[PDB]
Design brief:
The structure is cut from a larger assembly and holds chains A and B. Chain A is an all-alpha fold. Chain A contains four helices and no strands. By secondary structure, chain B is of the alpha/beta class. Helix content of chain B is 38%, strand content 13%. The chains are: A mainly alpha, B alpha/beta. At the A-B interface, loops of A face loops of B. Chain B: Belongs to the G-alpha family. G(i/o/t/z) subfamily.
């Protein structure tokens, strides 16, 4: 249970950052940060909590892969 | 294809290779347009950079400059001004020791008003919307010695300030940087030049380097 809520809060925070960057696309601070690579890095951040959900799941043939 | 045609294609390929090499060599040089009044101290600045059109190549810290000059071209500037659309920067001279003088035998024309008119024409031209300007305000020593006997009210009726080299020079500088109506695309680098200054090449180097980096950042969509 504890990793689940930690991961959920992580997902919510990452979503907030992504949404605010989309809404403020043309501002100097956002443009100076390498937008096209910023989104890739944020996807990388998003994947880890899904990794939590995968490791808590029941072992199977698909889940091992 | 005959043997003669094969020789012709060989020769054409050699010519293409030579042209590509020459173009790559020419793409890495800073091109400067030197503008100003005839007596605005252009000659001294030209002398201390290098240690129809007149061309002056010079190098600083492993970088090259060509520095074209069009002072001796008495004709319509609208006809040939577009040949300089892609230059890196524009250098403009003012000669502050001109606010109490007249020019062109008009006998009612302040020299500095003519300089401001020329600056306004060049800064807001259609071919120069994203080209930075290096403004040299030279002959400042004559201004310092002269400012005591004559006040700034001859050239500027509204001054509301003191007669000192600290406030009048800044007043003239803020007049030239207020004629720019494109503050969000270009910028003006102002420097005070004088006899035996010897530090103007480095100022030009810094300004041009900042211009190059800003252009490269804007091309990436990173600025």
């Amino acid at each position: 249970v504890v990793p689940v809520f930690v991961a959920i809060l992580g997902i919510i925070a990452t979503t907030f950052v992504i949404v605010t960057f989309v809404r403020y696309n043309d501002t100097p601070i956002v443009r100076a940060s390498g937008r096209e690579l910023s989104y890739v890095l944020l996807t990388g951040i998003f994947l880890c909590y899904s990794i939590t959900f995968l490791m808590i799941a029941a072992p199977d043939t698909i889940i091992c892969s | 294809l005959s043997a003669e045609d094969k020789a012709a294609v060989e020769r054409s390929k050699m010519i293409d290779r030579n042209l590509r090499e020459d173009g790559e060599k020419a793409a890495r040089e800073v091109k400067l347009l030197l503008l100003g009044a005839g007596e605005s101290g252009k000659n001294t600045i030209v002398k201390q950079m290098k240690i129809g059109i007149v061309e002056t190549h010079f190098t600083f810290k492993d970088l090259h400059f060509k520095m074209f000059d069009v002072g001796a071209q008495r004709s319509e500037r609208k006809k040939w001004i577009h040949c300089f659309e892609g230059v890196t920067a524009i250098i403009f001279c003012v000669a502050l020791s001109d606010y109490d003088l007249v020019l062109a035998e008009d006998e009612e024309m302040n020299r500095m008003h003519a300089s401001m008119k020329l600056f306004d024409s060049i800064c807001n031209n259609k071919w120069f919307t994203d080209t930075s300007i290096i403004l040299f305000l030279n002959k400042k020593d004559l201004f310092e010695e002269k400012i005591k006997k004559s006040p700034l009210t001859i050239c500027y009726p509204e001054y509301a300030g003191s007669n000192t080299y600290e406030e009048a020079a800044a007043y003239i500088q803020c007049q030239f940087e207020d004629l720019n109506k494109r503050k969000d695309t270009k910028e003006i680098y102002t420097h005070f030049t004088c006899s035996t200054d010897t530090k103007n090449v480095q100022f030009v180097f810094d300004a041009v380097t900042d211009v190059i980096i800003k252009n490269n950042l804007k091309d990436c969509g990173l600025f």
